[PDB]
Structure formats: C-alpha cells, structure tokens
Design a protein around this ligand. Structure first.
Ligand SMILES: NC(=O)c1ccc[n+]([C@@H]2O[C@H](COP(=O)([O-])OP(=O)(O)OC[C@H]3O[C@@H](n4cnc5c(N)ncnc54)[C@H](OP(=O)(O)O)[C@@H]3O)[C@@H](O)[C@H]2O)c1
Ligand SMILES: NC(=O)c1ccc[n+]([C@@H]2O[C@H](COP(=O)([O-])OP(=O)(O)OC[C@H]3O[C@@H](n4cnc5c(N)ncnc54)[C@H](OP(=O)(O)O)[C@@H]3O)[C@@H](O)[C@H]2O)c1
Ligand SMILES: NC(=O)c1ccc[n+]([C@@H]2O[C@H](COP(=O)([O-])OP(=O)(O)OC[C@H]3O[C@@H](n4cnc5c(N)ncnc54)[C@H](OP(=O)(O)O)[C@@H]3O)[C@@H](O)[C@H]2O)c1
Ligand SMILES: NC(=O)c1ccc[n+]([C@@H]2O[C@H](COP(=O)([O-])OP(=O)(O)OC[C@H]3O[C@@H](n4cnc5c(N)ncnc54)[C@H](OP(=O)(O)O)[C@@H]3O)[C@@H](O)[C@H]2O)c1
Lengths: 106, 328, 328, 106, 106, 106, 328, 328
C-alpha cells in the first residue's frame, strides 16, 4: 500500500490522462483506488486502462482526486450524465451530497 | 498430472513438464558422473524435458558434465528445455552484476562450457542495484535477437522490479520477461501465494518453484539426528545443521510426524505428498527436484498418482496442522 | 492466361505464375524419383516457377527429392519461387506448434533438408490456440530479418485471426503477412467467395488455392467404380473411398456428367474446365496442381486455352447445374 | 455480425477517438455501422479511418452511439453545421426528428 | 543564456505542450524560466517535464509567456484555482496585480 | 499544382492537425496555400510544420479552409487576438471584411 | 574547383570529388582492359575518387574489369567511392524490378562480380509500378543494416516518388535516400533547374548528373558528318545517328559553333566549357564523365581552370545564344 | 580510494578504477616495448583495469604494442576495460571525420591492429561540423548492435552538442552516450567544474579526465630549466618549451613551490597531491595517467594514501594560493 512513484495511464475513448499511483490510492474505496476493481479494465498490449465512456466528465473526475475531494460539474455536461458518471466511478455518498449541495436543489 | 503432463510456462507458447531436474550440489560435487548419467537417463525416459543449471554451481563443472551427458547419449536438441542463470562469474569487479558486458560474456562462456548453440530460458539470478533497468532489458533483448537464447526470466525479484521491467519493455518496444523462480515449500508460503497471482493475472508471468523439500527437511530423515552422507553432514553446510538442531526444528519434526500419519493414511509417502502439495494450484507451472541416487528420484516421480487425491478436506486438515496460512 | 502469365501475389512485389506444382502424396511416396524429375522438368519448361512443399509430407522425403532435382539440373535460384509449411515436426511435445523455438528449429531443419539458404514464402500450416499472436508475429519477423525467408503467410486461418495478426504487426512495427492458402473447388465455394475479397480490398492479402480437382473426384474417373493405382485405392486413404462410395457421390457423378457435356461442347476436357473455373476472378492469384504422370500434367496445363472462353452465360449455366452458389 | 471485442480508431482531422466494434454495430443502417460504407475511408498504413471534417461535432456523434440514441448539440457549434454533420453521418430520420424536438422550433 | 532554438516539451497530466527555449527565458525569475527550479521535474526516459496538476489553466499560463505578459483567466476555471496556479508557477507580484485589475474587485 | 492526396501535418504548440493538400491549395494566396511561404516552418526530422502560436484559434483557421471561406470567431478568444491571427495567416482582405460583418461593429 | 575539390553528397557526411568516371559503353565493350587500367590510373592520380557502374552494362563485364583493376593496383578501400545500379538482372520474370528478392539477390551477385564486401551507394535504376514503396524502403534499409552498403539513392524518379519514399521512411523509422541521378546538359535543362532545388532545400537530397556532353554531340565532332570509330558509328546505336542527322542537329551544330567562338575567346576548348557549365550552381554535387582514350580524359579534367572564369555576363550570353531557359 | 576502489562510469553499469594508464607519447615512440610491458604489468598487479589508446597515436604502433602485451601475458578479456578514439585515419579525404563510412572502417582497422574482437568504449575524438548528428548516432548504435563495442562516449564536445546527441537518440529510439573526456588540472578548471555537473545530474553523463600534471609542468621538474630526456626536449614539442620558458611559467613555478611546501607539510610529494586533487569531487569517475619509467608510476599510484587527508581547510588554502577559482 505504498503506491510510490509508479505512473498510471488512463485512456477514456482515445483521450489519455496520466497521474501517479499515490494520487489514486488516497481514496481506496473507489473504482480507481482499489486494485481488485480496476483490474478488469487493464490492457496488457499497451500498458493502460481503457474505458469506453463519456469524455468531458473525466477532467472533473480526475480533479476530484487531485484536489483532495472537491466536486465541480463542468458547464457543458448536463446533470444526469454527470450523475451517472459519479455513480459509475463509485465516489461514494458524501461526493453525491457535495454534488447536491453545490448544485443548489439538494 | 505433473511429469508427462504438459502445460505452458506462464502465458508463453513454451510447454514444459511440471517436474524438472536441478543441477545443484550433486552434479560435479557430491555424486559421480556415472550416477549423474543414470539420473538423467531415468528422468528422460519418464517424460521430463526440463533441466536447470547455473554458472556458479561448482565453478562450471555442473555445466561441463551436463553438456557431456547430452552429447554422449545423442538426444535431439528440439526435445529438451535447458535453462541457465547468470550473476556471479569470477573474482574481478567486472565479472559480476547485470550490466551489458557481463551478460554477453557470461552467456558466451556458459554456451561454450555446455557445448550448445543456445539455451531456452536465461535467468537473472538476483537483482542488481548498480545497473539501470533499461540497460538490463536492452541486453536481454540483444542476446535474444542474436540467437543465443529464446526467452528470459527473473529470479528472487520483487513485484515492483518485475513491473518496472515490464513497463520499460513496453516503453522502448523491447521484450518482457516470461517467468520467475521463487522458493516454495510447506514452511515458506508467503510470496508465491500472496504476490505472484496478481502478476500472473495482470501481465502473464508464471512461476517455477524450487526447493520443495527444504533441502531434505520435509522428507523426514532428520528426526533421530544427523545421518551420515547427508547434505547436513557435508563440509560447507553448517548453517543447515544449525537450523535442524535448533528449537524450531523439533516443532517442525513433530508437525512432520503428523503429516506422515496423514500421508500414510492416503496410501503414499511423505515426500510424495510434500511434492504434490506444491502443484495443487494453477499459478505454479513446474517444480524443480533434487536427488542424490536413483531410488530417491524414482520415489519423487511417484507424486503424480497422489496429486488427484487431494480434496479440499485434506487441504484444510494440512492447513490446520501446519497453522501458517498467510492472510489475504 | 495462367501459366506463363504472371501476376502479383496479393499486393506485394512478388510475381508468380497462376499454375504451380505441389509436393503432396506423389513425391517421395507414390511415384519414383525419375518420374518426379520428369514432372519438374516438364513444369519448368512451360514457364511454371512456383513449387510448394511441407515438412510433414512423407517425413521430409519430399523436401529431400525436391532439393536433389534442383541441385542436379543446375537452375538459377533467382528464377524459382519455393515455399514451405511448418506445423508438425516430430513426436515430442516441443516439436509442434507456432512458438518461437519450433518456428526457428523447423525452418532450419527444412533449409538443411532442401540444401538451400532461404525460401521465398514460409507458411503457418494451421492456427495455434496455445501461443499468443505477438510471439508468432515476432518469430516470423525474426526469421525474415535474419535472411532465412523473404515473406510469410497463413494457411487455414479465419478472417478474425488474419486481422488480429495484421493489427499486432501494425501495433508493434512488425511485418504483416501477404497470403493465405485456402481450399477451393466446385463443391467447396464458401470461404474464398464470401470472406477473402473483403480482406483483399482492405489489407491486400491474396489467395493461393489448393485441391482444384477434389483429389481426383471432379476429373471424372470414379464413375464406374474404383480403378486400380488411384489415390482411393492406396493404403491409408479409406476416408476418400468412403466419401466416393456414399450417396452424395452419385449425385456428384451425375452433375459431373452434365458438366462433361458442357466441356465437350466447349471443345475441351472436364479437368481443364474445372481448373480454369477457379481462375475466373481476380481475387485468386495461383492454383496449385497435383499429378501422378506426365500425361496428366500435360493435360492440366492446357486450361490456358479454355480460360478466355468462359463468358457469363456459361458461368450462369454451370451455376444452374451445380446449384450451390453462396448468398452474399 | 458478432462485432466482438475488436477496437476501432477513428481520426477526425488529427483528433483521435477509440471505441469497440459492438458499440458501432448497434446501428447497422448508418455510415459507421455498416462495413460497406466505411471501407473507403480506411488507411492501411496506420490502421485507422480518416475524415477531413469538422472536429467539435464528433463528440456528439460518438455520444449518439454510446448513449443508445440521444442527440445533443454542443453549445459552441451552430445549427447548420451540426445539421450537415447529421446529414453526412447518415443517422436517419428519427435522429433528425429528435434533433428538431430538442432544438425547440421543430 | 542564449536559449536559442532548442524545443521544450511540457506534459501536464497527459496533455502535451511544446515551445522554444527563448520563449521561456524571457522571464528568468519564474519556475519555468530558471534552469535550477525546473530541473526536479525532468523525466530522462521521455525527454520532457511532467506536472501532476490542473489541465485547463496551462493554456493561460503558456499564453502569459507567448504574449509578452498578458494575464487572462479562462471562463471555465474559477478564481481560487487559477490564483493557486499563478502562485505555484511563480509569475511574480505584477502578474497578480494585473490579474486583480483584470478581474474587477482588486 | 495537382495537390492530390498527400497529407499534411500542422503542429500548433504541441496540438496536431491533419488535412489534405488539395484542401490547402484552394486558396493559393495565403501562407499555408503557397509552398514558398510555408517552407521556412518545415521540420525535417518529424515531417510536419511547427508554429509557436496561439492554440484555440487554429480550429477556426482550419474551418476557413474546410468550409470554403466562412469566418467564425470562437467564443473564448477575444477580438484582438483573433484579428492578429487573421493578419498572421494572410487570409486576405475579404476575410477581414467578412469578420467585421459577422462581428457587428464593422 | 571540381576534381580534387571535395564537397558533400547532398547533406550527408560523404565527401566526393565533383568529377567522376563512368563505366558505360567503353568498359568491357568498346575499349580493351589495358586502356581501362590506364584511364583508371590517370583518374586516380588526379584526385578523382568516384567511380560508377551498373549490373546491366555489358552483362556484368564492366563490373568484372572494374574489380580486376582495383585488386591489381592494390589501392586502399577507404580512399574510394564505388556505386552500383540495380534494375535488370536476367531474362526470367523474377530477375527484374524492385522487390525484396531481386534487390538482395542482385546486390549479392554484383558484390560477387566486383570482388568486394560492400559498395558505398546503391541506386534504384528506374521506378517500379508493381511494387509498394514500403517494401522497397524496407529492403534498402535491410541491405544497409547487414553491411552490404552504406547509403542508397534513386535514379530517374519524379519528385512525388522521392517525397513518398521520404514520408514512408519517416513513418516506419526507416532510412531515407540521399541522392538522385538525373540527366543534365545544355539541351536538357528542365528537371535539375526547376524541380530538384526544392527537394534539396526541403529534405536535403543532392544531385549527381550524367551525360554532360550528350554522348559526344556538344563536343563538336559531328559537324562535317559521322567520323569512324565514334559512338554513332557503332552497331546498336542507330538512334543517336538518326538524332544527329536530322533537322534539329543542324541548328544544334550552328549553336555549337557560336559557343565554340565564346570558348575560344575565353581561352579554352568547347568540352571544357560544356563540362564546367554544369557545375556553376551549388545544387549539383558531381558530374560523371565518359572517355574512350587518355587524351579525352586529360582534356576533360581541364575544366577546373575554366570554372572560376564564368561571370554573370558570360552566363547571360550563353543563355542568349541557347535560348532554352526554363521559366520559374 | 582511487586505484582498487571501483566506481561506476557515469550512471552505467560499467565499473572502473579511478586511475588508468594512457597510451600517448611513450608507447611506440619514446620508450621501448620491454619498458611498456613492465609498466603494464606494474599497473595490472595493483588493480588498474582501465587502459586508453587511439588510432592517431604513432600511426597505430601504440595499438600494436598494446595488443602484443595482452596476448603475451595471457590475461582474461573479461577483467580488462579497453578504449579507443576515432577521428583521424589517413591522408585521403574520406579517411577522417564522423561519417558512417569512416566510423565503421576505422573501428574495423583498430580492432584488427589490437587483435581483439571488441572494445569496451569507443570515443569520438572531436566534433564534426560537416556531418549531421543523426548519422553519427545511427553509426554508433550500429557498431554497438553488431558486437564491435559495448558503449560509446564523446571527447572535446560542448554541452549543447552532448544534449543534441541525447535528444536525437531519444527521438529515434537509439543509444545515448555515457561519458565525456575533458582536460582537467590545477590551471584548467572551468569546464569540469561549471558545465559538466548539470549534465551529470540531468542525463547521467560522467567524466573521465586527462592530463592531471599538465604534461609534467605541475610535477615541479622544470624550475631550474629544461632537463635532458624530458618531453619538452623532444623533437616536435617546441610549443610546450615555449609555454614553459615564457613569463607565465615563472608565476606557475612560484605557485608550484608554495604547493610543494603544502604537500611536504602533509607528508607526501607534489605529483601525489596534484593527482589526488582531481578526484576530490564525485563528478569525476577516473583519471588517466602517463609515465615514462616505473619509478614515476610507482610514485603516481601513491595518491591513494593522500586522498582521505584533504580536508576543507587544505582545499581553501590551495584555492587561496592558486587564485583561479571559477564563479558559479
Ligand atoms: N533460483 C535460485 O536461485 C536457486 C537456488 C537454489 C536452488 N535452485 C534450484 O533448485 C533446484 C532443487 O534443488 P534442491 O536440492 O534444493 O531441492 P530439494 O528437493 O528440496 O532437495 C532435496 C535433497 O534432499 C535429498 N532427497 C531428495 N529426495 C529425497 C528423498 N525421497 N528422501 C530423502 N532425501 C531426499 C537429496 O539429497 P540428500 O539425501 O543428500 O539430502 C536432495 O539433495 C536445484 O537444482 C537448483 O536448480 C535455484
Ligand atoms: N495448405 C494445406 O494445408 C494443403 C493441404 C493439402 C494440399 N495442399 C497442396 O495442394 C496441392 C495440390 O494437391 P492435390 O493432389 O490435392 O490437387 P488435385 O489436383 O486436386 O489432385 C488431383 C489428383 O488426381 C489425379 N489427377 C491429376 N490430374 C488428373 C487427370 N487429368 N485425370 C485424372 N486424374 C488426375 C492425380 O493422381 P491420381 O490419378 O492417382 O488420383 C492427383 O493426385 C498439393 O501439392 C499441396 O502442396 C495444401
Ligand atoms: N543513371 C542512369 O540511368 C545512367 C544512364 C546512362 C549513363 N549513366 C552514367 O553516365 C555516365 C557518363 O556516360 P556518357 O558517355 O553518356 O557521358 P558523356 O561525357 O556525355 O559522353 C561523352 C562521349 O563522347 C566522347 N568524348 C568524351 N570526351 C570527348 C572529347 N573531348 N572530345 C570528343 N569526344 C569525347 C566519348 O567517346 P566517343 O568519342 O567515342 O563518342 C564519350 O563516350 C556513364 O558512365 C554512366 O555511369 C547513368
Ligand atoms: N581525449 C583526448 O583528446 C586526449 C588528449 C591527450 C591525451 N589524452 C589522454 O591523456 C592521457 C594522459 O597523458 P599525459 O601524458 O598528458 O598525462 P600527464 O600525467 O599530465 O603527463 C605527465 C608527464 O610528465 C612525466 N611524469 C609523469 N609522472 C611524473 C613524475 N612523478 N615526476 C616527473 N615527471 C612525471 C611523464 O614523462 P616526462 O618526465 O618525460 O615528462 C609524463 O609524460 C594519455 O594517455 C591520453 O590517453 C587524451
């Protein structure tokens, strides 16, 4: 559980993101923070994780990890698409609560 | 279901038997050349095609006698799998390590002693902190592309070093390794059971285990004391004798008596159960054996009959007696 | 427009005649060496430059006699196209498959039997489920870069496996294959007509078809029964005799009588029409023939004169009589 | 018609998109869903399909396939450019009807 | 201090930017303009500088160098994130003053 | 002056654009449409043209060529930056007239 | 400033003299071996290090005599630049073109005839429409990496084909070409002056021009008629005689008389001015010469003294007399 | 802590001693072969494994005598590190520079003179403005991949050229250099101290310094005048004598007298202090020595005892006396 120094490449429909492993293992209860859940998306020929999903949401998903827990919806993406992305990436219940608090109506 | 039952080495296309013969203390040392030829003929006639040696074993005399037996008996090269290990090559400073110079020179000297043109797998015997990983992967890719080897693997590396070698090979379009040699018996269970299946499921690196009988401890011959002409009575092996005669060895002998009662209930001997216990999972591809005479090898081959008799209740009973199962 | 009329093999720069000679059951088996030399001289004097063999045919004796004839007659190496196929090499476990070890050892043994330095195309004889595709493409690229071959192709693969080999070669900057050997005659029409033109238009992989006369069925000699000294009367060929004597063979003989009436109207023989029917489309580059004596080969070469006489009405009449056209 | 597992790279003026073949073959009546129509855009030296067309529209075009049929115009792209892109990629008539219903005036 | 002609690749979480060295050495008092400060971010296996930071801010950070000193916040990025990026990249105090003058309230 | 079939890669500060040569040679009076003017930006080691300029303007610059002559300013880019980009890429005087007509005030 | 004044071949690191000696019609054909040895000794003693031949010239006899002279005189290999050209190799279908098979076999046969281990530059003699460009660039990169050549170039290609070869080499990380051989004299001015400087400024491909005297037309010997023992009086050269005797040749002879008046005013001969006119720009690296006897070669070497006397007024006067300057 | 104390050459896996022996003016020139054998035996018996030569030193006679001594004494190849330098190879135009042709031919001629199969490091002796960097890096990668060398490095290059070579190697997936040879003594301090540590911390390029005694100036023998049988009294060395006899040499002799007083206080000789001063920082991997007889070499080896006695106060006192410390 050191998570030290190794770099991880995440491919979202051809758009590539890079980070360190200690950034991802700050939240071990999520899909990307747990090694047992993300192992079915590994591509051995290219050394990356591949997701066939929506592209403008993963900048906010990665900034949730890089800022220590801040949820901020992009202006282009609607409510239901971003809610489905939060439900897929398994960020928890307090991330949904912060999303509903930041979005007003909740 | 081990010897003359073949399986892939990792996820590669190379198929090996699950019992092999090892070229440690016996060959060139403890036993004669005629006994070595008798052991190799007895292993080859039962379907074993895997033979493993190193350049440090008796300063190359094991490789010399192994190359003599193959050339005398006239076997075809395409029906044999020969492996070598390279870390220690001499007394000078430039004759050890995992640099490009020593890898090329050590593999050329080993092929000259073995009277062969190539080996099948070439192993790095231990990790090197003084060399970058990129130089090691480039030198291994170089000796594969020149025709001096077919595959390469590691030995006594950790999981971070194997993953670093894989990522360097994928970065620079080089060749990744296929195998890892680890120690595995009934009193050494941690690494093979908790660290290697993740690597096998992720990047397809198999395991080839060594010392299944803990240099003769699990065979049950040291209960009364130290018998003559054993490995513990040889010169240069005081550490094994001090391990046997200590206070942990008595508890190991008591647990070995209980396991001998279980193996006698199953209808076999204790070394057959101890060898067949290492092959009960699919993450282990092969087990390397050692033997001093032909009766030991003919007894050790007979674990094939006791491998399908291992149900889950017997495995749970063995884990209850041993009491050292690692936690996942 | 088949023999001494040359065309590219796929989209590569290698140009072959559209009739070749095959080294199956006859060479080293059914016929003598002098008849084999007579057949090769008769094929070479008419402009055929393509000759095809394999390492499994009569345990290498076909390659031995094929290497003897070339060295005796003194032909130049630059005017010949020689192909070999590699899957089966011996009785041991490591002497079959498509791993790196068997590809290198089998090609070296075939080149030693043929007394040659290189072949032109080396084929994989059937697909291997126990080997990754990347190891196969890397081994084929290795033997091309060492100078032991010029090109490589596949045999009896499906379209997904050929596309996977192409995508692995484009991913790792390796060499893609150029050709595929498939079975094609009047009663086996599916694969060449519905699956291969998509691959030829997409990635430029040509086709080199084999067995145009269905081992002698479409030639029209088995109408009365089984004549002596035929392929069905040989030992080890009970399956062909059971295929001929069954209830489907009678309907095939009736359709062959109607096709013989059409070919007699056109002014030729039934094997000439059956050979020239396979070359009516541009997706087929060459047809490999078989012959037992020189009269059969001199008759089979004469399909060149009947190839330009195939209009659309005759093709529609043949499709009406046969009745097995696949649906696109 | 299995469309199983094989990955497809689509290059739109230097911007690269990746997807699976079973995503594209859900709609066999379109340009990308039919193998006979998209075969003239294949590049054999690079193993990709190349289009010399407008770049910010293909995110919405790909999300039409990935969401099961939802049409949503990007905020930057005007009406006529996106209508010409829908007409080129041959999404049908019900996609045009959903576009006119989502855009108001229709 | 010639800074002539050599190209520099900067990698911001998988998004790659290229420039010339004489563009960066116009401001020697910053993180990217000084060779002693940026040397701990060099990656020798790939010949680039790597930062595990926020992606939509570096277009404005690079346009500060390319336009000779103009600060312009992107419309998507909030105030505090862009202020933290200006504080990290060490643009100075007059860049903060121009940012507060352009943003109104200062 | 055939301009047939050959592909051209244009690199704008690390962001890569691809097009065909017959698209560029529709306007021979510009910087990219004339071979004598663009030859000083060629990079022989990488087979591309490199410009160390502003990144969000070249999508509109490329859409000027691909649409047959339509000028449309991006919403993010200001007036003076886009005017300087039009002046650098030498689109002419009627492109400036269409820009002033589309922008209102002209 | 041409011979014993050295310059780079294109933008590569290979430095050549700007006069070379060519192995066309004379060597193995028109002249004897002793005259060929005398010409090579006279060229080598004046500082010329560039010698150019081909596999089609007198069916290899030019390469045989060129390899005999070098081995007889004992010159060092590191002081010579030897080039060969490969398109035509025999009468069979597979012995011509630019495929992988013919490139490897033709270069091996040329190196066996020349008694050498490698050449310096290997040229493709003309373009091939039946082969893909990727196969040609991969075969040229293969023979460079095996040590049979150092560089490669093209001959009689257009600018689109050279740019396609460059882009394929940059795409697949292969080796681009360095040179192009084009025809250039006073009545053939288009390609070298309007198409090649763009390629030289863009991708650094130099030019090595051939036939500076238009097979002896610009030398001024055919004004009265056809003298005996010339190239036009030889068998197999009726086309040159029909070109000389036609109505265009009279206008060429009148313009040659005016240019002879200019060259007599400058203090030299007409072939010296015609050779030195080709080297007046920096885009041409070398000029290949031809000679039948030693007096012609000793006269042709003397253009070095008349190269610095070409001012802009004399070039404008030559362009006014000739009247065929291409428009940029 | 210099000789028989080993350290890595740069950040590579090659380990060298920090004293080496150089094959300049003495070998093949000033001294005999028996004295050269005595010097090499005395260096090898004390743990020095690094020996350095070049192809320009006495036109190859230094390489000839160095290859004779190694073959006579029967030392193992795996315990020695041999380096060569290549820029000047002959009188012709094509026998100098850093093109592909001269690198391959010069390394083959050097290996033929040395009677070896490979060298360890091959150096480029000076930069070449007439060759592109990509051709140089591709030729060095070619001779490493063919087995004629293991590593390569530069000599007398600037930092921009070394960084350009690194960036070209990373762009085209080639091999970067590992080392740089620079001049470093007490009166030449700029480059090693202010330019090379940035390259060592960034891309891991070490330094191997030469001339630690300024061809005998810092040894303190020229205070009275020019003694007989010195390097300044030899023919062809008027420049060193004019440097010694000028007005700067008197100030250098006065500073050498003060440094001799310091070294006599420390308990050693002035050449031992001057050699051990070059190894006080970690950026220098090795120092190459020169010696005319065995007493000089036995004195020069004794700097190992005076290396750990250099505290910061003595270094500050030496910098105060010298007064030429560069500013960072
Ligand atoms: N990767 C590495 O670094 C590494 C390191 C070490 C070894 N290895 C490999 O491991 C292989 C196995 O060597 P090993 O000797 O340690 O394996 P082992 O099977 O655990 O050793 C058994 C020892 O006990 C004795 N023995 C064997 N069968 C017996 C039986 N039925 N009854 C009583 N005694 C029996 C034998 O001689 P005695 O009776 O005289 O005791 C034998 O030496 C070696 O060949 C070597 O290739 C690899
Ligand atoms: N890729 C693969 O895996 C594969 C597999 C199998 C074969 N092949 C290739 O296919 C090639 C063709 O072999 P094939 O024998 O199957 O082709 P074929 O032409 O269909 O076989 C014709 C057979 O019928 C007989 N025959 C030939 N001409 C005749 C004629 N005018 N009249 C009457 N009988 C005639 C011949 O001997 P009989 O009279 O005694 O019958 C001959 O053996 C082989 O050489 C082999 O290289 C490839
Ligand atoms: N890349 C290609 O495909 C290609 C094709 C063709 C040639 N080349 C090269 O071009 C090179 C040059 O060949 P070339 O003969 O055509 O060049 P050339 O110099 O134009 O031919 C001159 C011819 O005229 C005669 N001549 C030479 N000097 C003379 C002088 N002062 N006075 C009167 N006559 C003189 C000579 O013999 P005569 O007096 O008997 O006429 C000579 O054959 C050849 O060696 C070949 O390597 C290349
Ligand atoms: N990379 C390059 O381009 C390059 C260029 C030049 C040299 N090098 C290398 O540098 C290496 C060192 O050569 P170097 O001679 O210049 O080094 P050096 O040690 O500075 O030269 C010392 C000279 O002074 C004399 N000497 C040595 N020890 C002495 C002592 N205790 N007392 C009095 N005199 C002593 C010796 O002969 P004398 O008494 O006769 O003077 C010796 O020739 C060479 O071997 C060569 O490989 C490299």
């Amino acid at each position: 559980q050191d998570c030290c120094g190794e770099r991880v490449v995440i491919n979202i429909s051809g758009l590539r993101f890079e980070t360190q492993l200690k950034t991802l293992c700050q939240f071990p209860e999520t899909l990307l923070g747990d090694p047992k859940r993300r192992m079915r998306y590994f591509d051995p020929l290219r050394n990356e994780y591949f997701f066939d999903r929506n592209r403008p949401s993963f900048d906010a998903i990665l900034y949730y990890y890089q800022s220590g827990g801040r949820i901020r919806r992009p202006v282009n993406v609607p409510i239901d698409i971003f809610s489905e992305e939060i439900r897929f990436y398994q960020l928890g219940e307090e991330a949904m609560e912060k999303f509903r608090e930041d979005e007003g109506f909740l | 279901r081990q010897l003359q039952f073949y399986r892939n080495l990792g996820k590669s296309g190379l198929r090996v038997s699950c019992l092999g013969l090892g070229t440690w203390v016996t060959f060139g040392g403890q036993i004669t050349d005629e006994m070595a030829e008798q052991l190799m003929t007895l292993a080859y006639d039962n379907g074993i095609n895997l033979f493993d040696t190193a350049e440090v074993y008796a300063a190359g005399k094991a490789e010399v006698v192994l190359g003599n037996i193959i050339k005398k008996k006239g076997w075809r090269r395409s029906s044999l799998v020969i492996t070598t290990k390279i870390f220690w090559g001499g007394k000078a400073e430039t004759e050890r390590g995992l640099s490009r110079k020593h890898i090329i020179e050590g593999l050329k000297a080993s092929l000259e002693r073995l009277q062969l043109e190539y080996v099948d797998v070439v192993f790095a015997n231990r990790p090197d902190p003084n060399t970058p990983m990129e130089e090691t992967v480039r030198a291994m890719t170089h000796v594969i592309n020149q025709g001096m080897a077919m595959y390469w693997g590691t030995s006594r590396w950790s999981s971070m070093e194997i993953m670093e070698a894989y990522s360097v090979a994928r970065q620079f379009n080089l060749t990744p390794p296929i195998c890892e040699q680890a120690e595995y018996h009934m009193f050494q269970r941690e690494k093979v059971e908790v660290q290697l299946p993740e690597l096998f499921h992720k990047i397809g690196v198999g395991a080839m285990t060594w010392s299944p009988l803990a240099c003769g401890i699990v065979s049950g011959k040291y209960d009364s004391g130290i018998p003559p002409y054993s490995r513990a009575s040889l010169k240069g092996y005081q550490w094994l004798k001090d391990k046997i005669l200590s206070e942990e060895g008595r508890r190991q002998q008591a647990k070995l008596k209980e396991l001998q009662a279980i193996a006698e209930r199953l209808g076999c001997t204790l070394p057959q159960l101890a060898i067949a216990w290492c092959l009960r999972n699919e993450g282990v591809s092969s087990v390397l054996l050692g033997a001093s005479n032909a009766d030991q090898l003919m007894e050790n081959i007979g674990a094939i009959q006791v491998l399908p008799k291992l149900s889950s209740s017997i495995i749970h009973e063995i884990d209850s007696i041993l009491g050292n199962k690692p936690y996942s």
